[PDB]
Amino acid sequence: SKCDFDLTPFVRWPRQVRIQRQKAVLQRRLKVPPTVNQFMNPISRNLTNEIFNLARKYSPESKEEHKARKLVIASGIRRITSLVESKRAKLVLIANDVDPLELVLWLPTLCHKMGVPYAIVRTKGDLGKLVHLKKTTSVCFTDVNPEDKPTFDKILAAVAHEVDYAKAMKTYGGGVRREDEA
Amino acid sequence: TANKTLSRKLRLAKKTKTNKNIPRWVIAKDHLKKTWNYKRHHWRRSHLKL
Amino acid sequence: PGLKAKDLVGLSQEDLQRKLADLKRELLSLRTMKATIARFRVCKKDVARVLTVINQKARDEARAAFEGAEHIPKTFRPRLTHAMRCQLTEKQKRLLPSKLMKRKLQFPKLKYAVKV
Amino acid sequence: RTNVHFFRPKTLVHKKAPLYPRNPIKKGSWDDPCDLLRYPIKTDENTTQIEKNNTIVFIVDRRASKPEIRKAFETVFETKVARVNTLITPLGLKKAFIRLAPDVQAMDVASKMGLA
Amino acid sequence: MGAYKYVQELWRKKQSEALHYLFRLRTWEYRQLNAIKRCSHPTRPEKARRLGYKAKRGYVVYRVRVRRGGRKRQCVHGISYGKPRNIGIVGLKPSRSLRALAEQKVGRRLPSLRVLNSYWVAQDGSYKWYEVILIDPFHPWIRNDPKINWICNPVMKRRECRGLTSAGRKARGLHNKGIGAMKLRPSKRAAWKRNHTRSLRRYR
RNA sequence: CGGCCCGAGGCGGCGGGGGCGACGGGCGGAACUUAAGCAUAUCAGUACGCCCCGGAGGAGAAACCAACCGGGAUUCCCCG
Ligand SMILES: [K+]
Ligand SMILES: [K+]
Ligand SMILES: [K+]
Ligand SMILES: [K+]
Ligand SMILES: [K+]
Ligand SMILES: [K+]
Ligand SMILES: [K+]
Ligand SMILES: [K+]
Ligand SMILES: [K+]
Ligand SMILES: [K+]
Ligand SMILES: [K+]
Ligand SMILES: [K+]
Ligand SMILES: [K+]
Ligand SMILES: [K+]
Ligand SMILES: [K+]
Ligand SMILES: [K+]
Ligand SMILES: [K+]
Ligand SMILES: [Mg+2]
Ligand SMILES: [Mg+2]
Ligand SMILES: [Mg+2]
Ligand SMILES: [Mg+2]
Ligand SMILES: [Mg+2]
Ligand SMILES: [Mg+2]
Ligand SMILES: [Mg+2]
Ligand SMILES: [Mg+2]
Ligand SMILES: [Mg+2]
Ligand SMILES: [Mg+2]
Known part of the structure; x- marks a missing residue:
């Protein structure tokens, strides 16, 4: 018992740890434009979980691919975008933490114009687990088998009530004071 | 000096050992007329910088 | 005179290690007699004949201990300069892209003669 | 938390494991008995050294220490050393003063060697 | 069409609110790091492909920081x-641009690597940051590939x-x-x- | 508790470093001298200093020249 109180608040952390913590503070503090702010407000957890359950039944081959010496979801930004551009995507799922953010900043605008519903979902890492890759920016449903439209048509309804594009482009983010946040 | 490093002792030791005349049988063997080894040195007039 | 290198070929390692022990000891005797004569010349090079063979039998043994390994000791690697070890292979230098190749099979090389 | 400082976490450390040997053949060096000893120095001053004081004077390779000299002399001349003094002469050679055990006659040992 | 046509269009609007915010977060971060630093992946994937980058083993990317302004003589x-x-x-003014000095x-x-090309990522009042592409030329994926x-x-x-690089070529006027x-x-x-040679022929 | 992201220590295989009185590429860069003086000019985009290759190097298949009853990537020679 060297110290009677707790010393953790006063540790001098390594440089790499301090920079990523201060980066997270700077985005609560500054004034975030709406096109960037929309990636800070993903879909809720309940609706995300019950899309991930639908999606893992259109999941590609995992570990038969060494044993190979179906309707499936699509992955990747190059292929997704040409499907929205030809009106074949029925749902796009966009990740929330794409590090170069300009790869997808324009993509909700495109889906809106072309008439495709979309949803921002947390952690690109999770989407990669849906297609047996490490990470991915986006996935898309192109069609489903008939037993699943009693859920796909209902999931589109919950998406429509929850993702609002008009207020997405009008609201700024950030601007949080220290004493205010607590 | 009476207090010298082994590295300076060894280089001084080699100048002492090679400070010699041509052997006389070498003068007969190689048929020489120059008989003085002009790489010799003498302690009074030398400046070995070793 | 003295030992032939051919007549130690065929001798075992023990019969060569044991033969080297006497040669070393004999040069001690002959250096002691010198400082206190034709043989002493031949003995110095008998020692070199044997060590030549002990090393030549040991290199041929080890160079088969590694004959089929991926990584070989650097003493047993080919004899090349530093620049040669770093050059591209002729196959690597002759590789062409797929589209570029499929156009060289079209339009081959032809012999022809023109007239005045 | 007791200490206020952050130190590097403790992580596994491996031992080395080269895929090929860097020295596939074990070669000899300068040191071995009958090569470390060169010859004895024979003078009337040095003969007195043997008849009384039971001591033999030798020239040896400069890289040899007193413990290597004791062992070499004991294995080559099959006797018992007691104490070894050494110096490097103004010409660069190493001289060893080798005193035999109080129950050995260096006359008996110098004679068999030829020193007398 | 594909996605990189939109990304190129976006990067032609550097004055916009969106890119003004993202350019601000990057310069704060790069100011907290060393002058020469290895990057995991290119910060601009589409420009990296325009200059010859390929996501294969043997291509690497480093970020380089250089200082702004003119030149002072060493007198x-x-x-x-x-x-x-x-x-x-x-x-005075340096003869080579800041892009060439970064490489x-x-x-x-x-x-022990080979420099390929470079591009701009950020700047502020004291520094500009460039990213440099480099190839390891003894990797087997590199050696057996006719493209590189x-x-x-x-x-x-x-x-x-x-x-011999593109920025070095410009200063030579090429x-x-x-x-x-x-x-x-x-x-x-x-x-x-x-142009200044005296050629003295035999049958002058 | 796992994933992804951003880092740390170790281990294995492979590569780098230095060397040359020429030719070749990239930088920094004089003064004597001439002007019958001397500041711009000239000497000279030279001496010399630093870095980097090869058996050659550099350059190169037009964001070219032209003004014709037109030529057609680069280098080198003759010519003004
Ligand atoms: K002395
Ligand atoms: K003197
Ligand atoms: K700097
Ligand atoms: K011109
Ligand atoms: K130019
Ligand atoms: K003429
Ligand atoms: K100059
Ligand atoms: K002056
Ligand atoms: K002056
Ligand atoms: K001048
Ligand atoms: K001048
Ligand atoms: K003057
Ligand atoms: K002048
Ligand atoms: K002047
Ligand atoms: K002028
Ligand atoms: K001038
Ligand atoms: K001038
Ligand atoms: Mg070589
Ligand atoms: Mg040896
Ligand atoms: Mg002593
Ligand atoms: Mg290593
Ligand atoms: Mg002159
Ligand atoms: Mg004048
Ligand atoms: Mg004058
Ligand atoms: Mg004057
Ligand atoms: Mg001029
Ligand atoms: Mg060339």
Whole structure:
């Protein structure tokens, strides 16, 4: 018992740890434009979980691919975008933490114009687990088998009530004071 | 000096050992007329910088 | 005179290690007699004949201990300069892209003669 | 938390494991008995050294220490050393003063060697 | 069409609110790091492919920070001697651009790699940041690939030291052809030596 | 508790470093001298200093020249 109180608040952390913590503070503090702010407000957890359950039944081959010496979801930004551009995507799922953010900043605008519903979902890492890759920016449903439209048509309804594009482009983010946040 | 490093002792030791005349049988063997080894040195007039 | 290198070929390692022990000891005797004569010349090079063979039998043994390994000791690697070890292979230098190749099979090389 | 400082976490450390040997053949060096000893120095001053004081004077390779000299002399001349003094002469050679055990006659040992 | 047509269009609006925010977060971060730093992946994937990057084993990316402004001569006490045309000390300009200086700094730090190309990522009042593409030329994926294994041949060592990259080419004047460029094509030194030669023929 | 992201220590295989009185590429860069003085000019985009290759190097398949009853990537030679 060297110290009677707790010393953790006063540790001098390594440089790499301090920079990523201060980066997270700077985005609560500054004034975030709406096109960037929309990636800070993903879909809720309940609706995300019950899309991930639908999606893992259109999941590609995992570990038969060494044993190979179906309707499936699509992955990747190059292929997704040409499907929205030809009106074949029925749902796009966009990740929330794409590090170069300009790869997808324009993509909700495109889906809106072309008439495709979309949803921002947390952690690109999770989407990669849906297609047996490490990470991915986006996935898309192109069609489903008939037993699943009693859920796909209902999931589109919950998406429509929850993702609002008009207020997405009008609201700024950030601007949080220290004493205010607590 | 009476207090010298082994590295300076060894280089001084080699100048002492090679400070010699041509052997006389070498003068007969190689048929020489120059008989003085002009790489010799003498302690009074030398400046070995070793 | 003295030992032939051919007549130690065929001798075992023990019969060569044991033969080297006497040669070393004999040069001690002959250096002691010198400082206190034709043989002493031949003995110095008998020692070199044997060590030549002990090393030549040991290199041929080890160079088969590694004959089929991926990584070989650097003493047993080919004899090349530093620049040669770093050059591209002729196959690597002759590789062409797929589209570029499929156009060289079209339009081959032809012999022809023109007239005045 | 007791200490206020952050130190590097403790992580596994491996031992080395080269895929090929860097020295596939074990070669000899300068040191071995009958090569470390060169010859004895024979003078009337040095003969007195043997008849009384039971001591033999030798020239040896400069890289040899007193413990290597004791062992070499004991294995080559099959006797018992007691104490070894050494110096490097103004010409660069190493001289060893080798005193035999109080129950050995260096006359008996110098004679068999030829020193007398 | 594909996605990189939108990304290129976006990067032509650097004054917009969106890119003004993202350019602000990047300069704060790069100010917290060292001058030469290895990156996991390119910060601009579409520009990286435009200049020749490929997501394969053997391609690497480093970020380089260089300082802004003009040049000061190395003269003790600020004294040039000699003729008055040669007296100036401050207010001079470097002969090579800052993009070329970035490539040369990282070539000196990493002399066992081959520099390929570079591009802009950020700037503020004191610094500009560039990213440099480098190839490891002894990797088997690099050597056995006809698209890139031109750089595995030894006339490609330390290219940025000899002025052979794109930014180094511009300072030598080589982005031009025709009138205004006739005295530089092999080299400035080579054209001078050719134009000033006395050729004394046998049947003069 | 796992994933992804951003880092740390170790281990294995492979590569780098230095060397040359020429030719070649990239930088920094004089003064003597001439002007019958001397500041711009000239000497000279030279001496010399630093870095980097090869058996050659550099350059190169037009954001070219032209003004014609037109030529057609680069280098080198003759010519003004
Ligand atoms: K002394
Ligand atoms: K003297
Ligand atoms: K800097
Ligand atoms: K002056
Ligand atoms: K002057
Ligand atoms: K002048
Ligand atoms: K140019
Ligand atoms: K011109
Ligand atoms: K003529
Ligand atoms: K100059
Ligand atoms: K001058
Ligand atoms: K001058
Ligand atoms: K003057
Ligand atoms: K003058
Ligand atoms: K003038
Ligand atoms: K002048
Ligand atoms: K001038
Ligand atoms: Mg070589
Ligand atoms: Mg040996
Ligand atoms: Mg002593
Ligand atoms: Mg290592
Ligand atoms: Mg002159
Ligand atoms: Mg004058
Ligand atoms: Mg005058
Ligand atoms: Mg004057
Ligand atoms: Mg001029
Ligand atoms: Mg070339």
